Design a protein around this ligand. Structure first.
Ligand SMILES: OC[C@H]1O[C@H](O)[C@@H](O)[C@@H](O)[C@@H]1O
Ligand SMILES: OC[C@H]1O[C@H](O)[C@@H](O)[C@@H](O)[C@@H]1O
Ligand SMILES: OC[C@H]1O[C@H](O)[C@@H](O)[C@@H](O)[C@@H]1O
Lengths: 47, 247, 297, 247, 297, 247, 297, 47, 47
């Protein structure tokens, strides 16, 4: 195993780190929606 | 590495420790801390890449009430320092990113320890307030700020006089059962963060909504945004029906 | 107090989280930020001490959204120096009446709305080695934060009386009730979906009858075995001849997420027992380690 | 088999028949009936195993209103009797278990017939009440009790003078279409048990909840406990909203 | 009446289900259990007859939870012998007001809460050949049953007046309303899920176009055919070249469980037509047999 | 084909055009139009089969407010005419069915154009009403009826003097991207039809029900009838709760 | 007016959709249908013109359900000729109060309940070449249509006063409210399920790690490869070694049907901007064509 | 491809047209239910 | 076929009867929940 995942669409492979922006935007939007629905109490979750 | 570079990196670590609690100027964010560390050492662009990557990772680390965040400050400082004093400017970034995550948990433990230690400080502040001394309360507040600054100023200076592959070596020379236990326990911690909220707001009339939400969450085809929209609609209907007979 | 004293109060309010003890979270920073106002109003030997005791009580909200409250606390306190018979009546009331609802909107606004977008925008440039990313993030966050603090503190101070009594209104309670309902719903969903407790003990290993598994020993050979296997899987037949049932399967047979909600209720009970959250988190880590050691988790 | 054993098993069958309708001392439960039948015959432990297995099977057979239960009494007596007078103490248990289930349905039919027959008994009780005779009502009640006792005392004594593989042979020498028709009709019987309840409580105010429950039941990811919790939450919200405008 | 007469009534009340006719279910047992009380109160020639008519009316509840009602009937009737002007007013009121709600809680408690656990505990020991299983079950069930009956009958007799008028209260009606809503919901779910009616006539057998089935005659051979077949199945293509649609599929296209709810409503109508449940059950068995004979089911 | 047949088919096309808007006698339905066009030409049974098939296809084409239907009239007339003057009585039906669907969209466009053009007609009717002329309003109404009759009378006569494989040839000699764009755009048109309804009935108190319906629709195990039943139950509960505190 | 005038009005009302302009849909047909009534009541030079303006206002409902309204309009107008002081007060109100709710029940009844079944019945015979199909459909539709129009027009005329004031009642309000709620719910479901907007740009093509795909190059050979592939697919392993994520996948990750509801809201806004629906439909066709041309759709 | 689908259970293959009445009845019932639930505003959908 | 199922986790194979207690406990809990939700009217179902 050499392709890890760190959340928010960050891979950081064995040689370089790349960000897929679709997954990052989805994570940002979902986290913001949960924060607005719970008053910012949704906690830290690896999306 | 020059001694002046050591002085500046220790100063940046102290500033990151202060802003770990202050959380206003955001000197503890990776996007600023990594470039500040790399600017005073000559590894500017590599530290900028590392800070950007870590900030992309640490987009949702926020302290909410007593639920402390993974404390991106220590990760940002220490991963950048280890990248600087290890060569491999751009190619060493995936190692700093890999070692940052457990060090974030370590910094979280340290900051909870210091927050617990802060209680006698405010007790002394109260005992000084009853004496009518207005300056000693300020001095205690500044001492509390400096304690959290030192909380990160110390590990960053300790990392400077040890070989680069010391944090990584310690992490790799760890039993598998310990790593798996920490990973398992990390998925149950957020529940505590939920409990504090439930203790804050929970009445006999909103518990049925909790039951409905818990039941509905088992439907995998419903997204989290869909669940939030359903909750908003239910709250709106409940509010509309509440004041239809009351008035 | 003139505009200069309010400016000093606002500048000193940026260290409101300097102590952050677990017992009374932002009491120290709140008392620190009010020092110049107390020195300006009360001066002899004792009213300063009473003000210190007043401002050393429990306080916790989003650090940036604490500026309007301060302004209200600036407006109401200044009357007491002159004399308005409002002593210990509303000075404690507005703080607790605003610390909750204002935190409930400031936390999503700054921590999870402005900061994530600003960080993503900065990281976009930073991943190419551009120094403009971090600089843009720092400047955009700093200017907005300071402007918000100053403007809201000034508005709270100038509207000192118009807003302390309007708190008892239909809009505030309606917002609080709707927010409570939505939060209960979404937090229940988050407890069910994000609290990961997976058990791995095997409970039963009863073998299946010879009419329910695919029996990959008398199957067509070549371009037809795959088709018949897929057709049998569509019919509901099992891949393996032995049926393995775990404790997680039996727990899910009752309701999914039962362990998560039980752990959440236990955490609520422990917190109600006046146990600090640090002890509970450190005990949950140890519980996970032990459960992995004994094969339970 | 000794004649005294025959007398005791007939008495135990009569007691099980009485307690099938009384349902208080639970002499009709397999856990008691099987061991009672095996104790008076010497097959103690084997009948204990059979009773435990059947009780594990018949954990939810309860009479609720006019929806009669599968009448575990006849199965408990007859399967144990056939196990006793067939040899194969412990190894013959799966045959007794296999033959018990259709005999439970047969006992259900018999007890339904006797409960239907009990109507003229209470008619005569009313006619005697109009005559002021206080003892004949007791006599008719005891006669009704004895009729249900005999309902099981007779088949158990009939089984005693026939070969062991008579019920099993009759069940095996049965046309397949009859077996499949009985199996198909057994899955639709419970609907009757539901209808009686719906007739008891059905108003124009609660029918929408029936509609919601019927719609929700199509979601396979929701368990029965989840559906019950959703119903409880909906009822609580409805009760809370009903008494907010009324008062 | 003394405690001796009440204990006699309690002992005689264990045969309250002795007759159990289909028209008036527990009228016979209820009248039987009241015989000593009637003989103790009314003695001449006629008040006994009126009492017999009173206690021979329709009665049905859980047999063990019929003891408190009896106690109330013991408390209210004893006044009529002395004289209290309450005749045929509440004696027919408390029975019908209690037989429903008390059965609705005694059936889940004794039949489905205590008995299943006691039977499982006894069977645990019985499966190893231990006589202690049945003995434990028998003793634990009978002691609890007799104690409950005696204690509740004594409580009902002692608090005869305090509870006959408290029935008209907010708590009882709220419980009844909530129980009705919950029961309607859960019974609808049970009608949908537990009433099994599966039709097996084939309606249409239209063949699929040559772009929708996997076509297992021109597929890769060896370690690639399986992969491509799985990918085609993921794309939604069908295994067989002919599409079979049954009557059950068309019924499920409208709504699942339509036949179950239709049969339930038909049974409701038949019961409302004063048809005994035994006839309906025997007709449903015959209907299933016929439907299997003609291929409908 | 005889000239009298031409006159009759043009007359039937005019009648179908009139009944496309009148929608009372249903001369524009395939079931009537196809058999009428085939009766005056000798192709009775083939046109009856085509009309039955097209009516089976066009069972739900109804004009609702400003959401015009696919205008089954033009398809019914033109596909049947092309079937008549192309030989292949019964075997040519699948070609007429295939060419009918795009011609239905063409007729929808034509009828939308004429409905738009009808606005100055009623403007002239108003201007005549202010002058007190009661007969010119009738004349303008009849002219509007005749315009929509001609809308279909013209294409049916144009198709008469061209080769049969002209509409099919034009449809086949069409670029693939245009056909795909039309197919994609046809799945989004119905949204407009929804919008007109939402603009009609949309209040702040029914929007939560819209949110709940939109969320619930994502559950694939719930049918459309199930969703409708859930909506009925929710509306009934809301109505019951609304008038419990009001009165 | 006599019965002959009412019959003439009813016969003339079958052309109520003759003009159908987009601004005032059935104003022309409604004005046409009232011509003989206007000529019968008002005769000199001016009241006819006023009646024309009254009946040339916006009108739209199901064409067959417009007959009762006409009858009411026949009853209310006839008083004005004699004199009842009700002028332009209720003659305009009943039309608006009836055109909506009556269309909402006549559209499902005639367009989607009677016509589909009649057409299916006719087509059943027509598919065998029987002329009886179309004849039956024509006669059954036309007799019912004419009878409905005549009977409802007569009922509306005779009950002219009894129904104009009963419109302001609880039953109509409850029906309208329930219909609005049900329509909002079902239309939201229909927007989600029937508005098809599928995007086909590929966003990310990140390859999977060598622990997540089936890796069809080192698999068992013969009757076991299929089994292990099915077991790995059940374990969650992917068929292909590269993971392709499209724009549609990212949109569905937020909520399914977001594009459909966004397009619906945009159409609502455009309609509120007084843009004709024909322009919006033609714009959506062009948008689909362009999106297919640029690969977006 | 030679087996098209035209909705309401109409196939109209390369040589003949056939109607499967189960699908046609399902389409009719579903369209009627949607029209009654939406007041006849469900739109035209190929069922 | 020789491994029958009799409900409540009872198998009763061709030679012996065994009870799997997880399924038995699940059946007991589900039946009790249904009885409490329906007042003990859930009927007899082979769980
Ligand atoms: O809303 C709670 C608020 O107060 C807490 O003490 C801190 O963690 C803040 O960061 C947080 O925003
Ligand atoms: O609740 C109904 C109650 O009365 C019925 O007649 C009997 O079947 C009892 O076993 C049951 O508990
Ligand atoms: O309900 C609206 C009603 O009026 C519209 O103008 C026409 O499309 C009719 O076909 C429709 O039935």
């Amino acid at each position: 195993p050499h392709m890890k995942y760190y959340g928010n669409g960050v891979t950081c492979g064995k040689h370089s780190c790349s960000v897929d922006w679709g997954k990052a935007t989805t994570c940002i939007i979902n986290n913001g929606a949960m924060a607005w629905a719970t008053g910012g109490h949704q906690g830290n979750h690896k999306c | 590495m020059s001694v002046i570079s050591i002085i500046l990196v220790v100063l940046i670590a102290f500033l990151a420790g202060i802003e770990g609690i202050l959380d206003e100027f955001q000197f503890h964010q990776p996007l600023i801390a990594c470039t500040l560390i790399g600017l005073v050492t000559g590894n500017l662009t590599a530290c900028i890449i590392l800070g950007g990557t870590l900030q992309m990772i640490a987009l949702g680390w926020a302290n909410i009430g007593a639920a402390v965040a993974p404390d991106a400050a220590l990760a940002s400082v220490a991963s950048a320092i280890i990248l600087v004093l290890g060569g491999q400017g751009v190619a060493g970034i995936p190692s700093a990113i890999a070692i940052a995550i457990p060090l974030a948990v370590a910094g979280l433990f340290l900051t909870m320890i210091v927050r617990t230690l802060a209680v006698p400080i405010v007790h002394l502040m109260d005992r000084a307030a009853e004496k009518g001394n207005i300056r000693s309360v300020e001095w205690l507040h500044i001492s509390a700020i400096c304690m959290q600054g030192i909380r990160i100023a110390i590990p960053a200076a300790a990392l400077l006089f040890i070989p680069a592959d010391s944090v990584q070596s310690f992490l790799e020379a760890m039993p598998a059962w310990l790593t798996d236990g920490m990973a398992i326990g990390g998925g149950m911690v957020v529940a505590v963060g939920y409990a504090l909220v439930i203790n804050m707001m929970a009445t006999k009339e909103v518990w049925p909504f909790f039951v409905i939400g818990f039941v509905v969450a088992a439907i995998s085809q419903l997204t989290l945004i869909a669940i939030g929209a359903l909750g908003v609609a239910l709250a709106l209907i409940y509010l509309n029906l509440s004041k239809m007979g009351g008035g | 107090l003139s505009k200069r004293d309010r400016l000093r109060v606002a500048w000193r309010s940026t260290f409101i989280q300097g102590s952050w003890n677990y017992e009374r979270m932002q009491n120290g920073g709140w008392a620190f930020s009010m020092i110049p106002a107390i020195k300006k109003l009360y001066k002899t030997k004792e009213d300063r001490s009473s003000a210190l005791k007043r401002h050393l009580e429990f306080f916790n909200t989003h650090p940036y959204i604490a500026s309007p409250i301060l302004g209200v606390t600036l407006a109401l306190e200044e009357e007491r120096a002159n004399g308005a018979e409002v002593d210990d009546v509303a000075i404690q009331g507005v703080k607790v009446g605003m610390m909750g609802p204002l935190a409930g909107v400031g936390d999503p606004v700054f921590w999870f709305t402005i900061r994530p977008m600003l960080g993503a925008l900065g990281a976009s440039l930073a991943l190419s080695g551009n120094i403009l990313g971090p600089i843009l993030f720092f400047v955009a966050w700093n200017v907005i934060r300071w402007g918000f603090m100053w403007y809201t503190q000034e508005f709270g101070y100038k509207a000192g009386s118009k807003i302390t009594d309007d708190l008892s209104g239909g809009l505030l309670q309606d917002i609080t009730k709707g927010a409570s309902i939505l939060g209960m719903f979404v937090l229940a969903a988050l407890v069910q979906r994000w609290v990961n407790i997976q058990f791995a003990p095997i409970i039963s290993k009863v073998k299946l009858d010879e009419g329910a598994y695919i029996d990959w020993s008398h199957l067509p050979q070549g371009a037809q075995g795959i088709k018949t296997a897929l057709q049998q899987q569509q019919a509901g037949l099992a891949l393996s001849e032995i049926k393995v049932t775990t404790l997680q399967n039996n727990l899910d047979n009752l309701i999914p997420g039962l362990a998560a909600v039980a752990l959440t209720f236990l955490c609520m009970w422990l917190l109600k027992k006046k146990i600090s959250p640090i002890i509970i988190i450190l005990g949950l880590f140890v519980v996970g380690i032990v459960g992995h050691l004994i094969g339970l988790l």
